[PDB]
């Protein structure tokens, strides 16, 4: 549906076509992250460090537990009904997240039946027997540091030094914690917070968390970096200072009839100036409909664009029309920077601004000349099996498109200035001339 | 002043109303961060690691000390005078920050009278007696690591291993340092740099810094995450390699007659398409004047929006007029993504795009039908005490607004495309049609 020939003529060189994947079908695993280390092996000279740490951690965790209890006290089985009056104000995502929190409350209670065992956990990773057939895992923050650094050195340093080191470790853990579990966490109910953010409760070590829970190795890293492996805090304990996090392990599902077309931006020549067209570099085509996509929220991979949700966004009529051939409607922007892509390789074919980049033919030793009325030059086997563009030498292939590509002129779009302040000034000028008319 | 009924009819569901808080009245505390550890307990085989570290740290700190001395040498008391000619070029914020730096120079000199005691600080946190009634605290970077890891293991590993570990620790500290105290820090005079950034001089452990200085626990976390607890480097020592930072502990003041109204965005139907209105999700109303707010710079809390400054920004006439009822002036954007909020809960009342989300009435077992001429459906007690929207079951309340809400049609705004490239293309098209006219 995209007129790739005309797009390449205005510098939109056809890039890698990627399939569109969105997280689906989350496998739910509940893990315990005990935010307080077990200092029983060094309690002899702990001092008041643990009490102050408990006070600070309770102050941090109390808003989270209150926001959770907002939904835990207004949700009950019918079939799961939610007290909208008691909730009062909520978004759809937050309401479904409250439903998910309620469904996780059964396993949360089963885990909380092991509160004493969670407290006695003296290793950074411990498996606890929930009901002799289900097991829960406790991730104790800083327990590794305690057991590996402080306990082995009780008598090597004075116990006051051990106390100070413990206080410093706890405060560093809190400092790393506060960006995630602090006042920024105003909606702990939502199960959209990534497991990487959740792992700050374990010191940012989400690798240990995920390998301990277990996962499908298929697309695991892709699900991680697409922010698809999310965690939801299910239970907050203000006495044992641990959280229960339900970690959502989704799979990747290919969106039907959806591919994301990357366009490689290449500067071109018009008049005697260098231009790059202002066209999205990632085009989502779904069910033969062209739309934008907020691909910054997604993980771009060599074969697929992997998102945690549908990030399709609408496309204006002019951009859809010019991506389909009406290139006079694709906007272009002046190139005043020396670092702009002068060429790109597409299907073994070079599309180059040979006016701005030195195009030389490595086989016949001749210079590939671009006239002033040409935007790009398509360089392929028919003209130059091997081409030198600057200092890089590229052996080319056959252009599957038109054979009169370099002789067929294209209609050029209108110049634009995509700077924010330039956008405001252009709005000013348009409003002024509109009022004049 | 906001027409919440009409706004909800075009998907702007009334969210949580928040009070507007801005930092004020900073309590100033001066702390010493010794950016070099005391290796006297392990100096036997330290090698040239500390000399190289001193060279690198001096290179890092010299621009900061020079930038400070630009004001310290051009600021005099009569009442505090600055030589504007000697300063030459400065912003208002930087000038007031230079005033703050000058007022902190007295305590800076009082602390620097303890230069020898600062150099002998062999613990990560040490309290020093300034004048037998004032105390200053020294935060020695990596001293905790030295005392906890390297000193206890002098003979366990070869001292060359201790030297290499010390060098690695110092280099890791410098690597974390350079993002904050490096060339990015071109305005150390400004007291707008957060204490979290300042704490990189202590390894990012601002929890230890703030607990050591002491603070009002009221709104402390909210002041941290709003970037209100800022630090100003007051003194840089290039011989003992320590900085004096004045930490500003402000309080929170509620802005008069100011509330920030959150609007929950919900897709609606017009014609046979989904639409979401392009209206700010956070409306600042102050003294009965409607304006935008750059709330990304603020910390949104369940009850208040907490900022380090007034982030109110002007609102265009059309947005103000349509937020007050003229919904034909609120722009809308086509919804092409499958992940859009189809409904929201406001005051126990559901506002749902029942055409796009399946609305079923849990009490009477009937389907809540939305006609094609209806944008949303207000679902409340009068029609459905309990409603099922998809799979989530919500018990509702009474809509305090109109009783003919679902029968009163609204005037619809113009479609837009808020993509940056779409914005540029729309500017192109408007300019073209304007020139044609």
């Amino acid at each position, epitope marked *: 549906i995209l007129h790739y020939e005309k797009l390449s003529k205005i510098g939109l060189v056809k890039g890698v076509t990627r399939k569109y994947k969105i997280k689906s079908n989350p496998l739910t*695993k509940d893990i315990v992250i005990k935010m307080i280390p077990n200092v029983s092996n060094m309690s002899q000279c702990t001092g008041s460090v643990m009490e102050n740490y408990k006070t600070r951690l309770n102050g941090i965790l109390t808003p989270i537990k209150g926001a959770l209890e907002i939904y835990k006290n207004n949700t009950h089985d019918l079939g799961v009904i939610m007290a909208g009056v008691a909730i009062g104000i909520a978004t759809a995502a937050q309401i479904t997240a409250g439903v998910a929190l309620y469904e996780a409350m059964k396993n949360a209670d089963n885990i909380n039946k092991l509160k004493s065992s969670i407290e006695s956990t003296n290793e950074a990773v411990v498996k606890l027997q929930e009901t002799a057939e289900k097991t829960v895992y406790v991730l104790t923050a800083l327990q590794d540091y305690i057991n590996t650094n402080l306990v082995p050195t009780i008598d090597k340093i004075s116990c006051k030094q051990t106390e100070l080191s413990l206080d410093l470790a706890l405060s560093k853990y809190l400092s790393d914690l506060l960006f995630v579990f602090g006042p920024n966490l105003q909606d702990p109910v939502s199960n959209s917070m990534t497991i990487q953010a959740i792992s700050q409760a374990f010191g940012g070590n989400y690798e240990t968390l995920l390998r301990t829970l277990g996962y499908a190795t298929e697309d695991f890293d892709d699900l991680l970096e697409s922010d698809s492996i999310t965690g939801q805090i299910i239970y907050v304990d203000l006495s044992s200072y641990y959280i229960i996090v339900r970690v959502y392990f989704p799979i990747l*599902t290919e969106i039907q009839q959806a591919y994301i077309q990357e366009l490689l931006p290449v500067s071109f020549n018009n008049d005697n100036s260098e231009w790059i067209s202002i066209v999205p570099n990632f085009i989502l085509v779904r069910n033969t409909l062209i739309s934008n996509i907020e691909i910054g929220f997604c993980l771009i991979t060599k074969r697929s664009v992997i998102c945690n949700q549908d990030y399709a966004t609408p496309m204006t009529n002019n951009m859809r029309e010019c991506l389909t051939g009406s290139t006079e409607k694709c906007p272009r922007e002046l190139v005043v920077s020396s670092h702009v892509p002068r060429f790109a390789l597409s299907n073994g074919v070079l599309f180059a601004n040979c006016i701005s980049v030195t195009c030389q033919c490595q086989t016949t030793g001749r210079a590939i000349s671009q006239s002033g009325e040409q935007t790009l030059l398509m360089i392929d086997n028919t003209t130059c099996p091997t081409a030198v563009l600057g200092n890089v030498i590229i052996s080319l292939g056959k252009y599957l498109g038109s054979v009169n590509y370099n002789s067929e002129g294209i209609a050029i779009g209108p110049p634009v200035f995509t700077d924010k302040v330039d956008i405001s000034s252009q709005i000013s000028s348009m409003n002024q001339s509109l009022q004049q008319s | 002043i906001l027409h919440y009924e009409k706004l909800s009819k075009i998907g702007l569901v009334k969210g949580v109303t928040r009070k507007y808080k801005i930092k004020s009245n900073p309590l100033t505390k001066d702390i010493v961060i010794k950016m070099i550890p005391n290796v006297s307990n392990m100096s036997q085989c330290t090698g040239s690691v500390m000399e190289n570290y001193k060279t690198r740290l001096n290179g890092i700190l010299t621009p900061i000390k020079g930038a400070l001395e630009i004001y310290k040498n051009n600021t005099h008391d009569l009442g505090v005078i600055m030589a504007g000619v000697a300063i030459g070029i400065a912003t208002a914020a930087q000038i007031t920050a230079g005033v703050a730096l000058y007022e902190a120079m007295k305590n800076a000199d009082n602390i620097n009278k303890l230069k020898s005691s600062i150099e002998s600080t062999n613990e990560a946190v040490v309290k020093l007696q300034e004048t037998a009634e004032k105390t200053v605290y020294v935060l020695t970077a990596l001293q905790d690591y030295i005392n906890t890891n390297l000193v206890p293991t002098i003979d366990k590993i070869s001292c060359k291993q201790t030297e290499l570990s010390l060098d690695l620790a110092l280099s890791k500290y410098l690597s974390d340092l350079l993002f904050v105290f490096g060339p990015n820090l071109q305005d150390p005079v400004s007291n707008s740099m957060t204490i979290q950034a300042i704490s990189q001089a202590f390894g990012g452990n601002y929890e230890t810094l703030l607990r050591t200085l002491g603070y009002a626990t009221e709104d402390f976390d909210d002041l941290l995450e709003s970037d209100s607890i800022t630090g100003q480097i007051i003194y840089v020592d290039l011989s003992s390699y320590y900085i004096i930072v004045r930490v500003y502990f402000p309080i929170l003041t509620e802005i008069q007659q100011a509330y920030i109204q959150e609007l929950l965005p919900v897709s609606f139907n017009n014609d046979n398409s989904e639409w979401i209105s392009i209206v700010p999700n956070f409306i600042l109303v102050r003294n009965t004047l409607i304006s935008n707010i750059e709330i990304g710079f603020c910390l949104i809390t369940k009850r208040s929006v907490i900022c380090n400054q007034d982030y109110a920004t002007p609102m265009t006439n059309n947005m103000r007029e349509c937020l007050t009822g003229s919904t034909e002036k609120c722009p809308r954007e086509l919804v092409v993504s499958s992940h859009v909020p189809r409904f929201a809960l406001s005051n126990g009342v559901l506002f749902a795009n029942c055409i796009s989300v399946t609305c079923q009435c849990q009490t009477t077992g009937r389907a809540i039908s939305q006609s094609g001429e209806q944008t949303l459906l207000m679902i409340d007690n009068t029609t459905c005490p309990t409603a099922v929207l998809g*799979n989530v079951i919500i018990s509702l309340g009474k809509y305090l607004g109109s009783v003919n809400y679902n029968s009163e049609g609204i005037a619809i705004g113009p479609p837009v495309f808020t993509d940056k490239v779409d914005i540029s293309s729309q500017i192109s098209s408007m300019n073209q049609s304007l020139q044609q006219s």
Partner: antibody
Amino acid sequence: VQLQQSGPELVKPGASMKIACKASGYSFTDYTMNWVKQSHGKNLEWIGLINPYIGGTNYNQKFKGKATLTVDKSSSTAYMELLSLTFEDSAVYYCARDPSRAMDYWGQGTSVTVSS
Amino acid sequence: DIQMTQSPASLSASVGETVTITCGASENIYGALNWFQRKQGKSPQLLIYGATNLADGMSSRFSGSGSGRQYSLKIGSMHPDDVATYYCQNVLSTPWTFGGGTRLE
């Protein structure tokens, strides 16, 4: 909560046929439907799932190309178009509702036979 | 694919005595194992999901356990009704495979 299959069909080899799976009693869009192939009355094997909410599909490698899953959100119906039918494609085909990972509600199944 | 194996392919025991239906997995599936009951001529019914959780509407005598790659479905006291075929389904990795099947008579 019901899943209505299209019904047993007699289809010629090399042809293409479509299983209909009407849904009722629940939110069709908010549940994923899986498809499984019951061959020889004993062996079960998962064909693929379709997420009607997002339009996404996840196929078994064995069934890529042979089976394509579509949905009809207007009719709350999910389809399984079977391509290039052979004798091995003669089996019992189920549509199973899936919240995320547990096929709790199944269609009655379509015993599809491939012959002339 | 994860090969999902059931040891007692065909088992017949007296009514009212404990029955353990063991299932195995080629790879560790971390409790992402579903159990399905397929009576003769009828669609498989979700029996136990998550390798421990009893599915709603199912009898309390189904007490399936297990962790890692080796699992087990327990019947306890039989009844003539649960004479069916039991399938343990892999759920961890995307090609959600099934076990061979246990026909209990």
